[PDB]
Design a binder for these strands. Structure first.
Lengths: 101, 204, 79, 78
RNA sequence: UGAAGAGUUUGAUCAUGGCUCAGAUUGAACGCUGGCGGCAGGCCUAACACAUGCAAGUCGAACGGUCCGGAAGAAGCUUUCUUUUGGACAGUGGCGGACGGGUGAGUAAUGUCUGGGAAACUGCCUGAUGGAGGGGGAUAACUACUGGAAACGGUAGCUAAUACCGCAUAACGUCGCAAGACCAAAGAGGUUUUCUUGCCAUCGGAUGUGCCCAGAUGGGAUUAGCUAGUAGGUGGGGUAACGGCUCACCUAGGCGACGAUCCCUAGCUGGUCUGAGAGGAUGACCAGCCACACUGGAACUGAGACACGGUCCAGACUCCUACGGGAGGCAGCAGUGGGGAAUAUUGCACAAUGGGCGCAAGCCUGAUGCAGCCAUGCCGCGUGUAUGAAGAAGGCCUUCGGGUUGUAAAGUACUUUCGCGGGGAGGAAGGGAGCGACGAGCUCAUUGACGUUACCCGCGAAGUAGCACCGGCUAACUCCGUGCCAGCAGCCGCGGUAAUACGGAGGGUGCAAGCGUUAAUCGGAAUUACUGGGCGUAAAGCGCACGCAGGCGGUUUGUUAAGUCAGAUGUGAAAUCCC
């Protein structure tokens, strides 16, 4: 976070997929982000589906992914272009998903 | 405070705590004897830490107080001289809200706490609206002259007639007053509490 | 103020430098520490010489560096 | 200019002024030189409304200390 | 009256070691979840750029006109016009703007902190002494004319003061020698021969400051020799004053491992938080000090600003423009836009308290006193409180026996919210008027919230509710689906047909809008350990000799007694820490 700030914005450079380590196997969704801090780190994309393109621009939280060595940050869904998960009945507090009527 | 279903805490503690209609055969503990939830029928498997935990639990539930102050009073009673267990009940039994209950002004400690906060209770003349107030001996606790009309206390004190009071107290239904003789000992109090089990827990 | 020191130099005229030393405890450790200071005392009579342990008292600033003057000589010589 | 005014301890439901002799520059509730008494507008806290302590102020009066209009009234009441 | 940590390196154990977890705080926020009430609080990100309004005036007991208002005249009425008078705007004249308010960039330095010293000053105010005689001179307003689109400006004529100047008296003060000579000063107003306001000179007081000194004040030497006015002397210049502060001449020193110089960072302090203490971190609200207002530099006038609404010069920007030339700069209040995860009414008002000016009347005062928006926090009520059937339905859990939610899951009443009506606080009384010399003092009246909130009284409807989590640490269970499949995970791990850690459902725990979560600060770590530690094998003794500084060092006596110790006194910044 550099300035030790809770959150930091950044423009995505590429929204590619990565595979877990030895004990796991899947297609975890990540994306390189150029935070305003001047650093280009990779953040994980929580949820079963996102809508992040090339000019996504999403706020970074900060969390290490035991599966993906390097991804020490998590994306905050529900802020900016990062649309919250759809039909999220459970984790709405996270991923940012308004309670259906 | 907890503020919620009290008729469930009784069963959970295994013992019938006097929260309200504990007299009537309505008290769930009388109909069904087992803690709340679905696992209340299954055979419980308590451990050492279990008996001590659930022990102080019912203790704090009776007086209906937070875990903070309840722990604070423990440290104090454990600081002063004399058996800790004895001193413990002394302080908790000294609470204004508690005294009012023992005096009969309130149906329960919960209602008593309300009466105090409502300034409907005085102490040695001056009014006191703090339930955590420590009542010392020789102190008189009567109802407010303006509150001497509310039907609620009018019915409470009415039932207080003929009813005996604790040796450490002495009320006057007529004047609707009361006096805190001295600090009640464990002998006077007949609570389903094991002062020796509650202390071990805090020991750890 | 009266200060005691040594005459480590008598090169200048009417001006002698006295090396005063003191012992103070450390603000943290507390152990005694040695600390000295050079003071240019006045000596119009050029009486005091090198090796003389004289006394120093505060007087009218004869100059910018000299604000002290010779009072009395404790001993005779100890180079 | 050394002046003798009232120091308001003013608090929500608590009006108390402290007739003190202090410099005019200093704030109304700043560092004062020396208190000579007190003043209770409602005079509810204590029966003794005010305690001028004549002898005390009698010293500053003439030393160059000037008393305000309001304080002068209380002082004159002695 | 003061001291209980845990998880993770092994197949297992001990030792070492780093990381990590719950605590308190922060001028916040995002994600999803909303009722109310008291109190408190709000751009911690771009000193980024800013629309609009506001942020200092006040005096006619200084002087001529205009505007506004009243009264009395020449007149039959009207027009017109005359005199007197109140307020004030324009001008002239006096005082004030360097107080208050905002911000923290810059800054390591007696800048600040603590105690002293003196080569000093101090408007208004207070005490004491003395005095105020005669005279002369100048510039505006105003009047006339001309130039310009405007700002604004040029010329000619008249004129006054508590505006300037020359001479006396000297209480005194200054200067040489030693114990002599020189040098001052404006009235005005009235209940006007009596006071009031003010002035000139001197001493002192009060208060506020300039300057100097001892000690203390972060990180790095992969920053070490550095320095020419640079160090000292004489004389001179300069200033309110010491000082190479500045100049001439002479001398040639001065400083450094007790680390100068250089570089980096940060307003400082009191304090705040934490801790048993020591100590660590921080210093945001409030109080003191310092520094800074378009960027940079400088000077003047003054008691004091080298001075936001003062001035001069350099640079950039925005706006106006018949482009000739001008007007500004909210890191002042509110507010806008941008940025950002993000933080509000371009609201109301002066009576009170306090401040500036005036004799007073009185005027000014978004300083401030309040309200509004946002649960951001805390206090008495998030998803409810109390009441309630051996309990026939529904939601939840289940060993399918049962159990649980038990206003019913219906209702009803509630703490009593909300809402409506009335009264309407100060937790402060004057201004004014009457008595008194509109002085002291006494008496009386008006004005209530801040150009109506709080609280009190009356009336009165029940009047939303959701999120996180349930393998262990973490308090809280199984069935079904899927099946190393899909997925969970801070660490140890779990899932290959019984998975309580995957998705769903019933049930349960937590929060009771907080609780979780994210971020930030402190200790535990006796893992720098002064109190609390180690170096044969775990990280760790220099290969040896010798030797400088330094540290340490036998015994006896005397003086000094600087260190050290003791009593008294001054300061102990205030605030706070502690009680």
């Amino acid at each position: 976070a550099l300035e030790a700030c809770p959150q930091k914005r950044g423009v995505c450079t590429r929204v590619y997929t990565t595979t877990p380590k030895k004990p796991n196997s899947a297609l975890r969704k990540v994306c390189r982000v150029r935070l305003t801090n001047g650093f280009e780190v990779t953040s994980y994309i929580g949820g079963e589906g996102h809508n992040l393109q090339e000019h996504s621009v999403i706020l970074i939280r900060g969390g290490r992914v035991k599966d993906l060595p390097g991804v020490r940050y998590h994306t905050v869904r529900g802020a900016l272009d990062c649309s919250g998960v759809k039909d999220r009945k459970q984790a709405r507090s996270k991923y940012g998903v308004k309670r259906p009527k | 405070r907890y503020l919620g279903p009290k008729l469930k805490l009784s069963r959970r503690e295994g013992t019938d705590l006097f929260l309200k209609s504990g007299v009537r055969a309505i008290d769930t503990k009388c109909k069904i004897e087992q803690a709340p939830g679905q696992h209340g029928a299954r055979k419980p498997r308590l451990s050492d830490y279990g008996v001590q935990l659930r022990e102080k639990q019912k203790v704090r539930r009776i007086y209906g107080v937070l875990e903070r102050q309840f722990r604070n009073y423990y440290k104090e009673a454990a600081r002063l001289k004399g058996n800790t267990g004895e001193n413990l009940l002394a302080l908790l039994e000294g609470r204004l809200d508690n005294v009012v209950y023992r005096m009969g002004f309130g149906a329960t400690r919960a209602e008593a706490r309300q009466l105090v906060s409502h300034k409907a209770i005085m102490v040695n003349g001056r009014v006191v609206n703090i339930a955590s107030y420590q009542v010392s001996p020789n102190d008189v606790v009567s109802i407010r002259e303006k509150a001497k009309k509310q039907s609620r206390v009018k019915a409470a004190l009415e039932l207080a007639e003929q009813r005996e009071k604790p040796t450490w107290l002495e009320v006057d239904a007529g004047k609707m007053e009361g006096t805190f003789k001295r600090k009640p000992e464990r002998s006077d109090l007949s609570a389903d509490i094991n002062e020796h089990l509650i202390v071990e827990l805090y020991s750890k | 103020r009266t200060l005691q020191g040594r005459v480590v130099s008598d090169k200048m005229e009417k001006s002698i430098v006295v090396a005063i030393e003191r012992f103070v405890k450390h603000p943290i450790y507390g152990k005694f520490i040695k600390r000295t200071t050079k003071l240019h005392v006045h000596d119009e009579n050029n009486e005091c010489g090198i090796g003389d342990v004289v006394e120093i008292r505060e007087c009218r600033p004869l100059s910018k560096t000299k604000s002290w003057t010779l009072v009395r000589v404790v001993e005779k010589a100890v180079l | 200019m050394v002046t003798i005014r009232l120091a308001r301890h003013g608090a929500k439901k608590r009006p108390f002024y402290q007739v003190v002799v202090a410099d005019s520059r200093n704030a109304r509730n700043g560092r004062f030189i020396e208190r000579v008494g007190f003043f209770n507008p409602i005079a509810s806290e204590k029966e003794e409304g005010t305690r001028l302590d004549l002898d005390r102020i009698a010293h500053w009066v003439g030393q160059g200390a000037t008393i305000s209009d309001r304080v002068a009234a209380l002082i004159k009441e002695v």
